[PDB]
């Protein structure tokens, strides 16, 4: 079974029911209600002063509601991180996702959150990426050089960085 | 088994690190045991108890409401923000933000709250106002966790933190209602399992807040006591060690276990 993992995160899909999510994640790893409202929040291994985790949001509180949002921290590692301060400074609001990735490096980013507020329509889709310099990613501690890049409808709306170069 | 200071010397030798500890009687404020209690240590997330103390002081003064809804933005989100990320689309109340900051160490929640008290400088001004001339916050989340050696930014001393916790939770500086709320958030801490809670005997009270940083930094501030009543404040900080998280946790829990074993010795 195990705790929440990157593999489980990838297997969980938009359009799934709460039961499908629980069956994949392992219900012993997950919680709902309280701080998390009608979302399902699932813990991975301890990291920093919290845990690696995923949070899955649903179209409503109904039993047949479907996953319309997927978020995670420290479950997914970047495939080839090459972000720098210079590259980050070249990123501009208004860029498409493809333009941003060409600027920061195609393997520099992971998906922090992705939400379809009009599911099953893609209208208003919001996407948040976490992007990393070469030794920036950490699954168990604190990042050493990262950026947050966020999009609506595939167009960059803002950017923020910590400790680049 | 070992006496508290014996255990701390063992832990420093084993970790190649530096421990700071104070145990203080809650009623009298007397220091019962201390180690490196005048050296500075990074506070990490332990500062969030002081932060919500400052927030509650504003509530008491009628300048803030726990029910006030804060609507925030993607720009506000930082590393380790499970609750605030979930609520991005709808916002969170001030009280919900304090609950997340304290019980889950939510970092964006802490930044949002910091803005309401005038930022790190504003929180440091609050500390000076309550008579703490040592503790200082200089940076926001997440840089405050860097724990660079010799860096005074975002540090406290075990003695100053214990005294400040005593002031917030038991003096006339916060209302009874606010003191109960601050303590309740600490009782409800969800991320402190591996530390003092792992060695706390049945029937004891605990309310705590933990912290983790870079470069081995780890810490806990706690109120605990037998017969399900708070009796003492315990502060334990660790800095400057290459040891793994498991080891850091085990050593803090061991120092806690020595304090508990030698509670009346």
Swiss-Prot record, chain A:
Its main location: secreted. Sequence repeats lie at residues 1-76, 80-165. Keywords: Disulfide bond, Repeat, Secreted, Signal. It comes from the Bacteria. The keyword Mitochondrion does not apply. Changing residue 150 to A: Decreases binding affinity for E.coli beta-lactamase TEM-1. The keyword Disulfide bond applies. Interacts with E.coli beta-lactamase TEM-1; interaction inhibits hydrolysis of beta-lactam antibiotics. Interacts with K.pneumoniae beta-lactamase SHV-1. Interacts with K.pneumoniae beta-lactamases KPC-2 and KPC-3; interaction inhibits hydrolysis of beta-lactam antibiotics. Interacts with E.coli beta-lactamases CTX-M-14 and CTX-M-15; interaction inhibits hydrolysis of beta-lactam antibiotics. This is Beta-lactamase inhibitory protein. The lineage of its organism: Bacteria, Bacillati, Actinomycetota, Actinomycetes, Kitasatosporales.
Curated annotation (Swiss-Prot), chain B:
Changing residue 249 to V/Q/E/C/T/H: Reduces resistance to penicillins about 8-fold and to cephalothin about 8-fold in DH10B E.coli strain. Decreases resistance to combined ampicillin and clavulanic acid about 2-fold in DH10B E.coli strain. Changing residue 139 to H: Reduces resistance to piperacillin about 2-fold in DH10B E.coli strain. Decreases resistance to combined piperacillin and tazobactam about 500-fold in DH10B E.coli strain. GO terms for molecular function: beta-lactamase activity. Its EC number is 3.5.2.6. A beta-lactam binds at residues 48, 105, 141. SUPFAM superfamilies: beta-lactamase/transpeptidase-like (SSF56601). It comes from the Bacteria. Inhibited by the beta-lactamase-blocking agents clavulanic acid, sulbactam, avibactam or tazobactam, or SA1-204 or LN1-255 via a covalent binding to Ser-45. Inhibitors SA1-204 and LN1-255 may be approximately 16-fold more effective than tazobactam. May also be inhibited by tazobactam via a covalent binding to Ser-105. The keyword Hydrolase applies. Changing residue 80 to G/K/N/V: Reduces resistance to ampicillin about 30-fold in DH10B E.coli strain. Disulfide bonds join 52-98. PROSITE patterns: BETA_LACTAMASE_A. Induction: Increased expression in clinical isolate strain 15571, in concert with reduced expression of a 45-kDa outer membrane protein, confers increased resistance to ceftazidime. The active site is at residues 45, 143. Changing residue 249 to G/S: Reduces resistance to penicillins about 4-fold and to cephalothin about 8-fold in DH10B E.coli strain. No effect on resistance to combined ampicillin and clavulanic acid in DH10B E.coli strain. The keyword DNA damage does not apply. It is an enzyme of class 3 (hydrolase). It catalyses: a beta-lactam + H2O = a substituted beta-amino acid. One of its GO terms (biological process) is response to antibiotic. Pfam families: Beta-lactamase2 (PF13354). Broad-spectrum beta-lactamase which confers resistance to penicillins, as well as first- and third-generation cephalosporins. Has nitrocefin-hydrolyzing activity. Inactive against the cephalosporins, cefotaxime and cefoxitin, and the carbapenem, meropenem. The class A beta-lactamase family has a specific amino-acid numbering system, sometimes called Ambler or ABL numbering and often misspelt as Amber. A multiple sequence alignment was used to derive a consensus sequence and then the consensus was numbered taking into account insertions and deletions. This allows use of identical numbers, e.g. for active site residues, despite differences in protein length. UniProt always uses natural numbering of residues, hence there appear to be differences in numbering between this entry and some papers. Interacts with S.clavuligerus beta-lactamase inhibitor protein BLIP. Belongs to the class-A beta-lactamase family. This is Beta-lactamase SHV-1. It comes from Klebsiella pneumoniae.
